[PDB]
UniProtKB/Swiss-Prot annotation, chain A:
It is found in: Nucleus. The chain holds residues 5 to 116 of 580 of the full protein. Essential component of the NELF complex, a complex that negatively regulates the elongation of transcription by RNA polymerase II. The NELF complex, which acts via an association with the DSIF complex and causes transcriptional pausing, is counteracted by the P-TEFb kinase complex. May be able to induce chromatin unfolding. Essential for early embryogenesis; plays an important role in maintaining the undifferentiated state of embryonic stem cells (ESCs) by preventing unscheduled expression of developmental genes. Belongs to the NELF-B family. It comes from the Eukaryota. This is Negative elongation factor B. The NELF complex is composed of NELFA, NELFB, NELFCD (isoform NELF-C or isoform NELF-D) and NELFE; the N-terminus of NELFB binds to the NELFA:NELFCD subcomplex. Binds RNA which may help to stabilize the NELF complex on nucleic acid. Interacts with the first BRCT repeat of BRCA1. Interacts with KIAA1191. Interacts with NELFE. Widely expressed. Expressed in heart, brain, lung, placenta, liver, skeletal muscle, kidney and pancreas.
Swiss-Prot record, chain B:
Disulfide bonds: none annotated. It comes from Homo sapiens. The HDAg-like domain is essential for transcriptional repression, and mediates the interaction with the RNA polymerase II complex. Keywords: Nucleus, Phosphoprotein, Repressor, Transcription, Transcription regulation. GO terms for cellular component: cytosol; NELF complex; nuclear body; nucleoplasm; nucleus. This is Negative elongation factor A. The keyword Transcription applies.
From Swiss-Prot, chain H:
Keywords: Nucleus, Repressor, RNA-binding, Transcription, Transcription regulation. The keyword Nucleotidyltransferase does not apply. Changing K331M: Reduces RNA binding. One of its GO terms (cellular component) is NELF complex. The NELF complex is composed of NELFA, NELFB, NELFCD (isoform NELF-C or isoform NELF-D) and NELFE; NELFA and NELFCD form a stable subcomplex that binds primarily through NELFCD to the N-terminus of NELFB. Binds RNA which may help to stabilize the NELF complex on nucleic acid. In vitro, the NELFA:NELFCD subcomplex binds to ssDNA and ssRNA in a sequence- and structure-dependent manner. Interacts with ARAF. Interacts with PCF11. Interacts with KAT8. InterPro entries: TH1 (IPR006942). Widely expressed. Expressed in heart, brain, lung, placenta, liver, skeletal and cardiac muscle, adrenal, thyroid, kidney and pancreas. GO terms for biological process: negative regulation of transcription elongation by RNA polymerase II. Changing K333M: Reduces RNA binding. This is Negative elongation factor C/D. It comes from Homo sapiens. Essential component of the NELF complex, a complex that negatively regulates the elongation of transcription by RNA polymerase II. The NELF complex, which acts via an association with the DSIF complex and causes transcriptional pausing, is counteracted by the P-TEFb kinase complex. Belongs to the NELF-D family.
Length: 112, 146, 148, 40, 144, 96, 97, 530
């Protein structure tokens, strides 16, 4: 995560331990570490009002848009220029090679 | 009969028969007409609807006979809370006395006032090559030009 | 007990399609204490029925007014107190179909029970709550008495 | 036109005659002629 | 043609068409006299279709007694209208023109050529295919 | 013009579904189409099958030896079965 | 559409399964994806059979001649065992397959 | 026994799941776990270790899609539709009523959902699935106040009235040509309920009194009331109460009786005939109910005639009165009654009635000039039209070398208002299948029907007939009939043309290359009409 400056469980540990303030800390975390789009920022409290975990939402959209990753690399396989193909594949490869160590992001690197 | 309200609900509570069922002229004898006002407001909205609208199906003489009770029940409808009941009451307020509908609904009705504004302006705008109703096909040249 | 259904009906049509049999007529009847439609084939020759006539109708599992089963065999020498003494027209048939307005996801609100008294067909449509006593391929008795 | 049927046709068929009484074809069209009477 | 070759013919066919009409009723003496001629009868007089104001049995009750085993069959009388199945009175027949043998009992319909005659799906065919040749022999003899 | 031995060709649309053009629609439904079919009075099948704008799939003959000399023994087997079925089932009589 | 609607078993609507099947059977069907895989494979092979029949019967004639009258035997089973069609049944779909 | 142990096990089960930190019952579940005798340190592992930042993963995927050139908005719609489907299948109306109970005005998130159209559509669909939910009811109220199913469209007035206004404005704007396609979506909702039907007909009576084309509204009442009639409904008494029928009590009695019957009877005609023959008639507009006049047409011109020759003059007198007697009105005051043409109209109606009920007729060739002069009356013309419809539409009519279709040629020659009627008959005959007719004979029959369509086209009814021709082309009929039709059309037309006429005639003129008016038309329209 930290290869691209993304906060991970180590960051969560250093922000949790030695902190007499868990509540604003977790609140600002959950706000500034949500999904980046204005419609969701209206809908997330409503979405969560029913006792519905954000886990289910996150997992479902993650699986769907990761399937879109696999579909788009499959499509660009024989689309247009080989230069554009291999350039975008090299870019996404270097991006997700930080995340090749992960079990859920290694298939992206392998498909690329 | 006892339980006139529940009996009328059992006879008219089916919420899918939005048209009043046939035989309603048989269900609205003088006694039951006088018993309706005893428990008029105890019924549901759709029941009140089908009930009030069945009065149009009755014979004209039978409409005239119980017209006091019909007027009372129509005023009970005018003071109700369900809007369908309110508009049908406003229309029916002149119906039992003569059989004439009340076309004075423009008062106290944003729906009707918007109908007036929008569609009168549209009609005044759509006066070019206006459609001619079905009976126009029957009329001769003089009657049609009239 | 053992009365699967009971009501009072009035006849709204004796034969709407014109008679197709000279002894049997297809009464169409309505119930006033509920909303039950009835179609019923009646042997009018022995039990004449006029238009607008009112009658009590009772659909019963047995006749002995004790719940004791009937055995489905003609016993003219039966001595038990029978419900048939309280009625004028008693037929004995078998329910052979129960239609409903059920969807794939909901229970039926309106049910239609079909009974065949030796060929004389009856349909009873109405709310499901009144027709739970019925169950296909169960023997049943239709008892009927005209009311003044 | 009517073709032979019944026991004459059955006899003609079990005999494998070098001439049927009414030999015939059933030609099917495929282009617009399948739909169009003039082209047909 | 995978169908019966023997069927009900002439007097018996016209008479069964008359017999299974909806409006045939038999007094008890007639019923007992007819049940004398039923070889497969178990000796139990069935309950009448009408108990009061007088005991009466219909033709279909006696014919259901004739029908062997527990066969099930659906046919249409020769005068079955071509829209009765589309109307409201589908499973209840105004003309009694839909033959429904159910659990070895004729519960509605008039029998004709197209129910007891020589055709695929006819009642004698199903009687053969279910109950075997012996019980179908007795079925034929009992009808006649 | 024309092909010899073919002295009369009648043109008509079929009123029986077996001769109608049954297709499978995009939704998997069977649709029967009215198509012009020509019934001759002679027989020369090789020429007609070779002819332009003649469907060389369903075009057939009621003469058996023509099918034998043109198509083959198995086509003869099928066409003979079809002709026997036609002459038997003309009067609505079914044979297994 | 009609073929898929009438023949593809649906295990994604709990209400229909409660209507048609007993509760333990519904929970069993919903729980394990192995049974779901078997049912969708059944529907897939029936679609293959449908295509095969379209090849065999291009005229679309459903009338056929076969040894065993399946509908009549099903009716006989219904009447022998007094199957009430108004109640949910205890027959597991995987047992049918 | 204490449930604290089982609650502890449930809390451990729930905490251990992936990304459970984001659940909002975490406060209560943590309280349960700590009060029961747990620890506040194991949950730190059960949440943080099992947290993989799947939300931030989705952020990376969404921004990657945006970086691929995929527009964000479709992905936003996709995820919003996902939330929509999930809420639809996880919906619980009691929960929604609880959000109503905690405050009558819902907390401000739902107003924000109102501000976005996708959630308005969600709430429409939810109310459609379950009409019984007071939250959903208040919400659809607020939306409409700010494709509603017909049940939901009638369930609330303010909804229904606004929807009726929009649909009626759509009908009037789309005019006589969109009338067919905007009627049923309108008449279904108006005929969905006696209350809805009565309300709509009342507003229609109010609006139609306007003289600047209120008749345009009044026909829409006639469409919708006949829609109620064919749906098996009591549309008669409502119509009688909507006019001046109460001023004439026995008139409304007889009229309602026969409309409920759906047919006439000499008792009612006796009352109406004596009512009208007397010099105090009710307004002729009162009895000009088009359904009643269809009763006249279905009784006086059907094969037969099943009519009494004594009562005949009464039926004809009422018909010629309803068609011909002209009443003058001055500010809702009947000025004068004009009984001028009732004599000649009744005479011609009697003549044509005698001919259509003769049926012995072979004398039709003789009565043709009389029939044409009688057809000049429009009512007589469409009486002949319905008679010809029932005559030709019967099976096995075509055993003649025809005459009844030349009548239709006259009918469309004189009255343009009957142009939609004649076409609707011809297309039906154009699509009916004939068995006893040879295939070439059926071809020539349809050629004759195309001749009738071409004659109708010559009377300025070009657009609907050419649209139907293009339809049955692209949707069936052999290309030879279409080719013959366009040949006949190109025979008699001359330049110049109109843009719409070429918009419909030209796109059907490329599927065939068989035949000079064709190349001349091509040379004209290509240059002038791009």
């Amino acid at each position: 995560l930290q290869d691209l400056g993304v906060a991970n469980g180590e960051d969560l540990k250093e922000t949790l331990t030695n902190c007499t303030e868990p509540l604003k800390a977790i609140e600002q975390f959950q706000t500034e570490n949500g999904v980046l789009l204005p419609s969701l920022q209206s809908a997330l409290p409503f979405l969560d009002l029913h006792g519905t975990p954000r886990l289910e939402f996150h997992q479902s959209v993650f699986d769907e848009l990761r399937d879109k990753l696999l579909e788009r690399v499959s499509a660009i396989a024989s689309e247009g220029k080989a230069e554009e193909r291999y350039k975008k594949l090299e870019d996404l490869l270097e991006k997700s090679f930080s995340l090749v160590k992960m079990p859920s992001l290694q298939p992206v690197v392998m498909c690329v | 009969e006892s339980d006139t309200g529940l009996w009328l609900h059992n006879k008219l509570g089916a919420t899918d028969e939005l048209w009043a069922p046939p035989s309603i002229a048989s269900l609205l004898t003088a006694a039951v007409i006088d018993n309706i006002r005893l428990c008029f407001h105890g019924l549901s909205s759709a029941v009140k609807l089908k009930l009030l609208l069945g009065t149009l199906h009755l014979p004209r003489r039978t409409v005239d006979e119980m017209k006091g009770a019909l007027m009372e029940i129509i005023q009970l409808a005018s003071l109700d809370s369900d809007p369908w009941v309110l508009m049908v009451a406003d229309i029916l307020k002149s119906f039992p006395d003569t059989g004439s509908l009340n076309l004075e609904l423009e008062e106290q009705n944003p729906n009707v006032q918007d109908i007036l504004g929008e569609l009168r302006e549209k009609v005044g705008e759509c006066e070019a090559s206006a459609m001619l109703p079905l009976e126009c096909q029957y009329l001769n040249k003089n009657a049609l030009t009239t | 007990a053992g009365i699967l259904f009971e009501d009072i009906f009035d006849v709204k049509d004796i034969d709407p399609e014109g008679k197709k049999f000279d002894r049997v007529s297809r009464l169409h009847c309505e119930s006033e204490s509920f909303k039950m439609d009835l179609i019923l084939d009646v042997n009018i020759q022995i039990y004449p029925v006029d238009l607008g006539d009112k009658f009590r109708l009772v659909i019963a599992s047995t006749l002995y007014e004790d719940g004791t089963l009937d055995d489905g065999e003609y016993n003219p020498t039966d001595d038990r107190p029978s419900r048939a003494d309280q009625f004028e027209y008693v037929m004995y048939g078998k329910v052979y179909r129960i239609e409903g307005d059920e969807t794939s996801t909901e229970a039926a609100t309106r049910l239609s029970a079909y009974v065949s008294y030796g060929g004389l067909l009856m349909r009873l449509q109405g709310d499901a709550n009144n027709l739970h006593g019925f169950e296909v391929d169960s023997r049943v008795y239709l008892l009927m008495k005209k009311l003044a | 036109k009517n073709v032979t049927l019944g026991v004459p046709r059955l006899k003609e068929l079990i005999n494998i005659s070098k001439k049927p009484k009414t030999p015939s074809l059933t030609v099917f069209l495929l282009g617009q002629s399948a739909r169009d009477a003039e082209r047909a | 043609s995978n169908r019966p070759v023997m069927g009900i013919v002439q007097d018996t066919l016209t008479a069964v068409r008359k017999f299974t009409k909806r409006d045939v009723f038999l007094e008890r003496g007639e019923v007992m006299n007819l049940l004398m001629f039923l070889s497969t009868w178990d000796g139990k007089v069935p309950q009448p279709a009408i108990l009061k104001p007088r005991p009466l049995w219909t033709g279909k009750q006696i014919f259901s007694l004739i029908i062997p085993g527990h066969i099930n069959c659906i046919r249409t009388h020769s005068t079955h209208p071509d829209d009765e199945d589309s109307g409201p009175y589908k499973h209840i027949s105004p003309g009694d023109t839909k033959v429904v043998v159910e659990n070895g009992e004729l519960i509605m319909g008039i029998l004709c050529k197209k129910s007891l005659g020589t055709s695929a799906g006819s009642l004698v065919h199903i009687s053969y295919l279910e109950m075997g040749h012996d019980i179908t022999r007795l079925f034929y003899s009992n009808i006649q | 013009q024309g092909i010899e031995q073919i002295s009369k060709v009648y043109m008509h649309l079929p009123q029986t579904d077996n001769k109608k053009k049954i297709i499978i629609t995009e939704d998997g439904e069977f649709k029967a189409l009215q198509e012009w079919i020509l019934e001759t009075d002679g027989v020369s099948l090789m020429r007609v099958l070779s002819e332009k704008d003649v469907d060389p799939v369903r075009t057939t003959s009621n003469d058996i030896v023509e099918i034998f000399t043109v198509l083959g023994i198995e086509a003869v087997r099928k066409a003979l079965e079809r002709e026997l079925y036609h002459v038997i089932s003309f009067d609505g009589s079914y044979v297994n | 559409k009609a073929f898929e609607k009438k023949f593809r078993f649906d295990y994604t609507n709990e209400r229909a399964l409660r209507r048609t099947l007993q509760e333990d059977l519904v929970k069993d069907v919903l729980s394990n994806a192995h049974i779901q895989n078997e049912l969708e494979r059944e529907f897939e092979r029936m679609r293959e059979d449908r295509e095969v029949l379209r090849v065999i019967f291009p005229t679309g004639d459903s009338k056929v001649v076969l040894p065993c009258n399946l509908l009549r035997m099903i009716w006989n089973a219904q009447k022998i065992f007094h199957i009430n069609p108004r109640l949910p049944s205890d027959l597991h779909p995987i047992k049918v397959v | 026994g204490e449930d604290d142990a089982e609650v502890q096990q449930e809390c451990l089960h729930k905490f251990s799941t992936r990304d459970y930190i984001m659940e909002p019952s975490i406060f209560n579940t943590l309280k349960r776990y700590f009060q029961a005798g747990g620890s506040p340190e194991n949950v730190i592992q059960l949440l943080s270790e099992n947290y993989t930042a799947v939300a931030q993963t989705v952020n990376l995927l969404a921004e990657w899609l945006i970086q691929t050139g995929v527009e964000p908005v479709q992905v936003q719609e996709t995820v919003e539709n996902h939330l929509k489907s999930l809420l639809i299948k996880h919906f619980d109306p009691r929960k929604a009523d609880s959000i109503f109970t905690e405050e009558g005005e819902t907390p401000a998130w739902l107003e924000q959902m109102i501000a976005h159209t996708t959630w308005r559509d969600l709430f429409y669909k939810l109310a459609e699935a379950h009409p019984d939910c007071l939250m959903l009811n208040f919400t659809v109220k607020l939306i409409s106040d700010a494709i509603t199913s017909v049940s939901t469209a009638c369930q609330q007035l303010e909804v229904f009235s606004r929807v009726l206004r929009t649909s009626l404005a759509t009908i009037l704007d789309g005019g006589e040509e969109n009338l067919e396609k905007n009627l049923p979506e309108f008449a279904k909702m108006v005929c969905h309920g006696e209350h809805t039907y009565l309300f709509a007909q009342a507003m229609m009576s109010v609006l139609a009194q306007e003289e600047q084309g209120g008749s345009a509204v009044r026909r829409i009442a006639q469409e919708v009331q006949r829609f109620a009639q064919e749906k098996g409904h009591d549309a008669s008494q409502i119509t009688l109460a909507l006019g001046t029928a109460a001023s004439y009590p026995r008139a409304c009695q007889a009229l309602g009786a026969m409309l409920s019957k759906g047919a006439l009877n000499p008792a009612d005609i006796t009352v109406l005939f004596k009512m009208f023959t007397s010099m105090d008639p009710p307004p002729v507009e009162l009895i000009r109910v088009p359904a009643f006049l269809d009763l006249f047409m279905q009784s006086l011109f059907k094969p037969g005639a099943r009519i009494n020759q004594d009562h005949k003059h009464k039926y004809i007198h009422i018909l010629a009165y309803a068609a011909s007697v002209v009443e003058t009105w001055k500010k809702n005051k009947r000025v004068s009654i004009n009984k001028d043409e009732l004599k000649s109209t009744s005479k011609a109606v009697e003549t044509v009635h005698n001919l259509c009920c003769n049926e012995n007729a072979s004398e039709l060739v003789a009565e043709l000039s009389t029939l044409y002069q009688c057809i000049r009356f429009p009512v007589v013309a469409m009486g002949v039209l319905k008679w010809v419809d029932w005559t030709v539409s019967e099976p096995r009519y075509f055993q003649l070398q025809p005459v009844h279709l030349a009548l239709l040629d006259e009918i469309s020659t004189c009255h343009q208002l009957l142009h939609p009627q004649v076409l609707q008959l011809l297309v039906k005959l154009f699509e009916t299948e004939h068995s006893q007719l040879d295939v070439m004979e059926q071809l020539e029959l349809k050629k004759t029907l195309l001749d009738r369509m071409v004659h109708l086209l010559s009377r300025g009814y070009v657009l609907p007939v050419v649209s139907y021709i293009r339809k049955c082309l692209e949707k069936d009929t052999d290309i030879s009939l279409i080719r013959y039709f366009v040949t006949e059309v190109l025979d008699v037309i001359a330049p110049p043309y109109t843009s719409d006429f070429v918009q419909l005639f030209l796109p059907i003129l490329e599927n065939d290359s068989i035949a000079d008016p064709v190349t001349e038309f091509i040379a004209h329209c290509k240059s002038n009409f791009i």
